[PDB]
UniProtKB/TrEMBL annotation, chain A:
This is Parathion hydrolase. Zn(2+) 1 binds at H22, H24, K136, D268. Gene3D superfamilies: Metal-dependent hydrolases (3.20.20.140). It holds the Pfam family PTE. Keywords: Cell membrane, Hydrolase, Membrane, Metal-binding, Signal, Zinc.
């Protein structure tokens, strides 16, 4: 209600500061970092890359990130705790399920998944005592039967705990509409929900409609714009053809409609990435050498020079995340 | 060489004794036991249950089991080590991949997969220093492109280390002939390979032809039967409705054909099972309350009753697994 759980323990809302609400230390798979750390060089190398990355973002003004890696994205909260401490950057951990659940998850009922998400929020992740502060869910297309189960379990776990829900969808399919329908059917307030990867599209009427319903809008893939990589047979499905400035102007466009309170902005960056083709990290790092500093270093100045006042930018990057992450059951 | 890796370190083959070559402590998914131990009651409850079960198998004569759980079956080698030591039963751990690889595995090349299998055999599993003594692979009747990468990497790891390969098949679909072809294209000797779940079929022509090529034949799900449970679709789908005696008669059948040296026998049992419907473990434990002791307590006397000589049964339960597990270049 006033405290947010991080991988170093609870913090007050005022301690969160400039918060990146959709990031990853490492995009992987359950068990993978511990079974095959040499895939990333070593555990130590990955840790060190992350601490440098977070220290870079911290010098650009960032104070907290939300690592939205779930169980099936190979979240290792011990790694998150280690990196957080060494970089002095708060990290909020996530529960939920992304798009690669193993059989032991895919065969579970909504009631069972609800208990799993609740365990991670109320008791702790694994045997670490670290509690999740957000629920991450993902869907494709019009929402598969299992994904619907995940979304309902997420809503139930949110309703019991006050922690918010953040989603990945296919914005080019206006996938947020179907997510919103399911959440509302469960009695979840839209102000507990961020509809994300929303900058994957240029359909502003869609985004405005969601914000008008009280949904947070996650404009979280701004540096995923590539430009120059059409020779690559995997850098158009994970990156982009439009510029990052195009994506960033969506931020301005929602502000102007009166919805600055509904906007969350992030990089959707990571320091290791095993759930994709080999060497993808060298590709991504060359396209965005700023990493998690891209928002404070490129996007914030770009908006400032398009006329957005300081107080609005602080509203989006400090106030909005604090309101979102503070556990609440009140609408 | 004459020693094999177990979760308590290297043993001599003479120490393996009566060996069950296809078992599990817990059938799960990577990361799952550690993230959600309450699914099994608790980690402690699961360990206890396994130790009670292994101790009963030991009482019945079992000395070694091969836990063919892979990374993606949720193998927790620390759990295996804990229950091995407490039951005082040797457990051989596996590398390889089963039928649920996560993206971080299924996007890998055959060279990469070879490196991973070799790490688990030559360096150790995770950070435990425990090394795998067998490579487990699984395919779906018609082998997928990714499963074919997995079989080629398994062959390559086997050729580099001498450790054997054991497979999960759709035996009703003759899965072993496609596997065998890939393995031989890589130069793998059939004597390094067990074509498992082969008791899932009564096609003796298929079994005997692989046995004639020098493959080991895994008749390794003998107690799996949903007879009596036809009103349970999930248990019927999993266990089949062939009787355990039907499965067991294939052991006699292959002996009768002259292939006693190629038979490996097991229960394919487990003490927790999250990668199927909820409470499946209670259903399995009512079908087979003997658990992993089913082979020595029920199958062996059944075979002795049908006239199989004791020396032949000892050769199948002791000598054949020893020959199979012993690393052989
Ligand atoms: C790990 As991702 C590419 O869904 O943000
Ligand atoms: C975990 As199984 C049913 O493939 O032996
Ligand atoms: Zn995503
Ligand atoms: Zn992401
Ligand atoms: Zn199997
Ligand atoms: Zn098995």
């Amino acid at each position: 209600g006033d405290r947010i759980n991080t991988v170093r323990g609870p913090i007050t809302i005022s301690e969160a500061g400039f918060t990146l609400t959709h990031e990853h230390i490492c995009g992987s798979s359950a068990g993978f970092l511990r079974a095959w750390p040499e895939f990333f060089g070593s555990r130590k190398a990955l840790a060190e890359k992350a601490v440098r990355g977070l220290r870079r973002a911290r010098a650009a003004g960032v104070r907290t990130i939300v690592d939205v890696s779930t169980f099936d994205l190979g979240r290792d909260v011990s790694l998150l705790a280690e990196v957080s401490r060494a970089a002095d950057v708060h990290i909020v951990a996530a529960t939920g399920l992304w798009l690669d659940p193993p059989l032991s998850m895919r065969l579970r009922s909504v009631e069972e998944l609800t208990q799993f998400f609740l365990r991670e929020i109320q008791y702790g992740i694994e045997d670490t005592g670290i509690r999740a502060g957000i629920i991450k869910v993902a869907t494709t297309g019009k929402v598969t039967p299992f994904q619907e189960l995940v979304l309902r379990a997420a809503a139930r776990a949110s309703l019991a705990t006050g922690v918010p829900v953040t989603t990945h969808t296919a914005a080019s399919q206006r996938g947020g509409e179907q997510q919103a329908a399911i959440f509302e059917s469960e009695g979840l307030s839209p102000s507990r929900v961020c509809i994300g990867h929303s900058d994957d599209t240029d359909d502003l009427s869609y985004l405005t409609a969601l914000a008008a319903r009280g949904y947070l809008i996650g404009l979280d893939r701004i540096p995923h714009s590539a430009i120059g990589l059409e020779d690559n047979a995997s850098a158009s499905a994970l990156l982009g053809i439009r510029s990052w400035q195009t994506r960033a102007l969506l931020i301005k466009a929602l502000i102007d409609q009166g919805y600055m309170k509904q906007i969350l902005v992030s990089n959707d960056w990571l320091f290791g990435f095993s759930s994709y083709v080999t060497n993808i990290m060298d590709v991504m790092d060359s396209v965005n050498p700023d990493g998690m500093a891209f928002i404070p270093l490129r996007v914030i100045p770009f908006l400032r020079e398009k006329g957005i006042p300081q107080e609005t930018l602080a509203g989006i990057t400090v106030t909005n995340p604090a309101r979102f992450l503070s556990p609440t059951l009140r609408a």
